[PDB]
Design brief:
The structure is cut from a larger assembly and holds ten protein chains of nine kinds. Chain C has about 180 residues and is mostly helical. Chain C has helices at about 5-10, 25-35, 40-65, 70-85, 100-105, 110-115, 125-130, 150-155, 165-170, 180; strands spanning about 135, 140, 155-160. In chain C, about 50% of the residues lie in helices and about 5% in strands. Chain C has a three-stranded antiparallel sheet with strand order 2-1-3, with no helix packed on it. With about 5 residues, chain D is mostly loops. Helices cover about 0% and strands about 0% of the residues of chain D. Chain D has no helices and no strands. Chain I is elongated. The termini of chain I are far apart. Classes of the chains: A mainly beta (about 230), B mainly beta (about 425), C mainly alpha (about 180), D little secondary structure (about 5), E mainly alpha (about 150), G mainly alpha (about 70), H mainly alpha (about 180), I mainly alpha (about 70), J mainly alpha (about 50). The interface of A and F includes residues 137, 144, 153 and 187 of A. Strand 1 (about 5-10) of chain F pairs antiparallel with strand 1 of chain J. Chain B binds one RNA strand of 75 nucleotides through strand 6, strand 7, strand 27 and helix 1. Chain A: It comes from Homo sapiens. Chain A: This is WD repeat-containing protein 46.
Amino acid sequence: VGKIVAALNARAGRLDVMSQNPYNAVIHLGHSNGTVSLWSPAMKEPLAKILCHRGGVRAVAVDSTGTYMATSGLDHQLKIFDLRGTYQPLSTRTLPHGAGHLAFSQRGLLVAGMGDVVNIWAGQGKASPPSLEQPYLTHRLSGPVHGLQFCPFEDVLGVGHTGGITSMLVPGAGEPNFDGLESNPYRSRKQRQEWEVKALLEKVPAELICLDPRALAEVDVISLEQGKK
Amino acid sequence: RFSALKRRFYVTTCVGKSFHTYDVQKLSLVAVSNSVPQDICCMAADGRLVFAAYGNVFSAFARNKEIVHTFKGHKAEIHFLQPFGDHIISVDTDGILIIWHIYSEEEYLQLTFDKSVFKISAILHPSTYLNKILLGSEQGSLQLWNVKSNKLLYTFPGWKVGVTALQQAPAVDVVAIGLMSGQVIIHNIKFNETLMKFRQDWGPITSISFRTDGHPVMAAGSPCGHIGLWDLEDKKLINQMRNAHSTAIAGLTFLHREPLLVTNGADNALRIWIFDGPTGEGRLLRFRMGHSAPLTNIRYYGQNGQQILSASQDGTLQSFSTVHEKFNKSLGHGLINKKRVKRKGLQNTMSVRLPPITKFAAEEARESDWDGIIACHQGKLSCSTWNYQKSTIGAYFLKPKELKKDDITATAVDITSCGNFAVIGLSSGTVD
Amino acid sequence: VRKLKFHEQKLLKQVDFLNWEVTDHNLHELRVLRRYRLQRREDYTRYNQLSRAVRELARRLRDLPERDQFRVRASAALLDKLYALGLVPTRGSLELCDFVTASSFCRRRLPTVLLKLRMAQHLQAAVAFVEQGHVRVGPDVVTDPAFLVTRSMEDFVTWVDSSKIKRHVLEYNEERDDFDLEA
Amino acid sequence: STLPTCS
Amino acid sequence: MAEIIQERIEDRLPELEQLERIGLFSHAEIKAIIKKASDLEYKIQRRTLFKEDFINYVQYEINLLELIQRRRTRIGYSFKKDEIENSIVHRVQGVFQRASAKWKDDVQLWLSYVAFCKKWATKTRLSKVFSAMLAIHSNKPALWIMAAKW
Amino acid sequence: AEEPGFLEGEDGEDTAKICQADIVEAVDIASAAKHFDLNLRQFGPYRLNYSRTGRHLAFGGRRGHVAALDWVTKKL
Amino acid sequence: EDALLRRLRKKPVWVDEEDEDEEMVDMMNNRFRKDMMKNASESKLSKDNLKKRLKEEFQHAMGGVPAWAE
Amino acid sequence: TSLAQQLQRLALPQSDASLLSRDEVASLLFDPKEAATIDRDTAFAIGCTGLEELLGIDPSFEQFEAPLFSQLAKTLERSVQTKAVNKQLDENISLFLIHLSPYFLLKPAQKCLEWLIHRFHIHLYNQDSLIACVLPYHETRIFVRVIQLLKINNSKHRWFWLLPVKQSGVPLAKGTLI
Amino acid sequence: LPNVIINEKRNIHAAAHQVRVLPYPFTHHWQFERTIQTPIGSTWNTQRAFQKLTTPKVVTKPGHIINPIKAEDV
Amino acid sequence: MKVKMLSRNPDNYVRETKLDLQRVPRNYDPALHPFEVPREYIRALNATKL
RNA sequence: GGCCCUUGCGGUGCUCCUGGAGCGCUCCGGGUUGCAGGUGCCCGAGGCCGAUGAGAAAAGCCUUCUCUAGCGAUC
């Protein structure tokens, strides 16, 4: 539409660490206190605050399924949290250098960017978090890392740094079978414009964002008893 | 030399009493070493340190700048240095070979060889060999030694010419041997067979390098300044690079897994060659060059004092910066008919070359507007002008109109403070 | 992107990517940037915010009693500064002080004043001349197009000497003198 | 290299 | 587009999984059959249609039926004929009906349909085919003789 | 119809020490073309983003270099 | 891949007694050798294991075995 | 353009755009508009017919029936397989082109070349072999067509001097060759 | 939760979209919630699964006269 | 070492001719298609408005 | 002035070291990392004009999109 639906004051100082949960659609904010705040456009206050580090948090990343949360901080600790109602650190590991950036692939691989070196941790992922015991692949960049992301449906990793941009080969990171009607790499212009109208017809309002994507299904219990009265 | 924490190669060249280090990517100076009391005679590098020998004492350099370890105990000059792990091998003139631990500076082992029977002229440590070194002699025999056991494993009868170079081929058991006659012999030291032989009629073999980028090419230098390229697969001569350096070739090395050749010489030049053209024709890619002939006249240029103008017997005018070598510049050769030089290059146009400059005068005012340098050449009537900003020779040749012959020469030149006028004296006694 | 069908338009009404008038007012701003060539959008913001300050001062001054010495002295002080820069046509009442806009500041820039003096006929040509060092305000040469010229200083904008454009003007008028110009 | 450092 | 083809492949899935139950076919063979069936299905659901695509579809199903028939004798498994063979025959009959509706004037397609009905189909299905033939091709005396001969 | 990729060592080797050059020679020519190293150091450090469809890539430099490209083919 | 490819188609003169001995050298605690380790078990490799380890590193660095060498 | 130069230098035949779309198709026998309406079965039939015709004139072609003119070659696409498979394919294609070179003026050789271009994209992967095969017939017009198949626009390309005969549609002159 | 604070305030804007009453014939809200769980679009279901979910209750031929029931078709 | 990477055959995923229609593979994995409840509610809301 | 397979004539393609702006590498050493208070930012078109005013005019490349017309729905 082209209008600003919400403008929220975090009241936490400078904001530089931010990520979203694709399953949950909520926004994660890292702070120097060591806490991560969950935000939605409807509320003027954060949905939840989770203390994760003894120092300032500088990176945050979540998986596509929305189950696991990966954070790193100034205490040189890499943490994995279970977002499904428990909010406990599943795994802990101390690092020689500091993990500036974090990312998650569609198959559950986790990559951490420490200085000029990237490290990828791999786990079976079948109802389990990635294993921080020993990394899967390593690579050294020309300069310090400034950005990481996985290609959606390819087994490559994109790294941005001072020297330039590099593309790595990461076997087993991309999801094999894509849906032709949602995200087709081999789509024509006419296919693209048909999809865009369908998406625009199906846009979700901002106020429906909650911690539970299925919150619309449950009956409004407080409105029940008001009607019963 | 390869480096740790930095995936780059560095080349180190000896400069009198010091040495310089350059990155091979762009030939940019990265360090300058501290001076030593005597001229450096031999150098070696083992990645971590740089070893330099002067007189009968050799020292180890850290960070490419300062010494951290010095080794005394030799009574003769050292010609050979071989890094061996945490130990260093030094070979003297009289024939003493001593192995030293670098950090503790103690002497591990001392070995002597009879000068009449076996004078060491080349040393090599073959790859993947446990505590084994290969020794070559001027008499022509080769000895394989084991440092740990301190026994002679085997003696190669070799050839009667004499060994001048030893180089490890890209094979587990194959080495390349150069001879004084100009013959390169590819030999397997384990089973004692000669795979192939190559011969050049240019003098002794100076240095040998192997190309490892997927093409079986071998390069051997000559004291004449020529380089021969040999095909190992077909056992033939590929091509020859003539006059790569005016003086004798000192060292040539192919970069690892790269189609690049690094050469230096006594003509004060370090050059890079790339074999990417058709039919494997090497071409000049990069160079760091100074005057190749003894200097004739040097004068400070500018009141700021960060540059000096210098003239040499090679017929060139050059400016050397006193703050950093990145600001060094060359004004070119003395050339009449510059437009012909564009068509044919510097070579094939040697006729238009001018005699070397003997005296010159430079003035800094009006340098943007017109020429500010006047120079007189050897045995020449006319005086030539030069331009500093344009970095080339000027557009005028100043002479008396009435004279045409070269029997009279120019002896004294000067330029005025405002830069408008130049005063030239002649051997006949006329001042204009 | 595609032309919406009749049924699609009803559900997807008020959806337009390029035109967001309520949010950024880009279409109105674009006319200002093109009409008076503005290199940076930031320069337009400073003119617009400063224009609000002039208008806000005038409305507050109006609320003061008419027979007040403070209002009279302040009103005369405000209008003489605006008239000097050329933002207000005459030193009349405070009613003229309300007509100043961000475009009023743009009309006082050097490239558009060059246009009015008929030294250049095209605005992109006028910006070119100052950037290439052909226009001077007094002895000083001005290269920055963002340069508001005073009415008094307007009398003394002219071609810099030893310039090719001045040579063309003198050649046309049969007044070209090699001695005076090149010297 | 596998030479011992001392003696 | 692929919605009709997807419907037809999901209709083809149960006999393939029953064949995997039999041990007649391996899982990679089922994958290859699915791939080639989808490739042949994409050709006959286009906006521009050619007869050779229908012919290739019919020939591929006939070849698959022959391969199944050969393998059943070696295995000795004669159960579940109706789950697989009748489904394939019904699909081929539908393809023939669509092809004959699209191209009525081609006698050769009609004769191929008659031959397939003789070899694999119930006698009443072949009876319906002759009535469709003689309804629009009553001006050919030879077709009357063939119906009377049968 | 597709299967996810895999990489396992043999004779007790550790996958961490395996470098990219070893992978490229052992993988088909199609995937080998996806590994490249753009060298733009004159501008500042780069931030990169992939489109939701994996075909397109856009990146931005600290000094102000903004470019969008299809990365599968080498077009800008 | 190999199936598809098919469809498309002395005695050393000298010996060293220090090498014949089955002595072990510390792969760990040596700067040059620790980069050559593969798993944690090879903190100390024997003489024969070191030889093939050194040889294969040389061939990997050289890019393989040149054709003219054999 | 420094980024543009790096990207155009990084270009490879494997990541060609025409691999991912059917807007344009390269064909020796047909214009691209008609060539984009040809199924793989039709091109395979043309190639098999050309090879069958070639077998009558010269027997020794039979060895090319299996690796290049069979179902296995029909299903095979080079980009999916490794570098060793591509190298073996390069050897087979070079041998087959060496055998084809005497008969290039005949129509069956043109059909076989059309099938090879359609299936293996030899105009991108095997430029040198194709040029070696077609070079002795540089005075003919089918040579001009084969050159028009190639892309030699870059001035630093090996075959850049053959650019005008592509742009103007004229045979190569012998003086330029000399 | 050891170090997690959960905002107890309710999202009134989201609550407006939820169903207020409990529909007949459901006695408990857990019973009604079960029926709405299954998605019906073709995005989340196969084509034949989609067809059986969207089966119309009454199907009439457009042009045929509909007569009253006659003794179970006599 | 044994390594495999996903390599889609372009002839499988791209149509053969201009006359052909585009091939659309479908995956019903719920991870690929999130928000099944809110997305369907909007479609039902749009249906009543139409 | 000098030039002798030449030219008061013209053109190309590579190489030529970032001040801050490719840091970190002799040895030694890196192991047990041992919830104060924040309410921002943006929103003016009127000509003491020139000749409509991203002036005007012409060629070659990509991007976005509009109309019909067949064709497809027969199982």
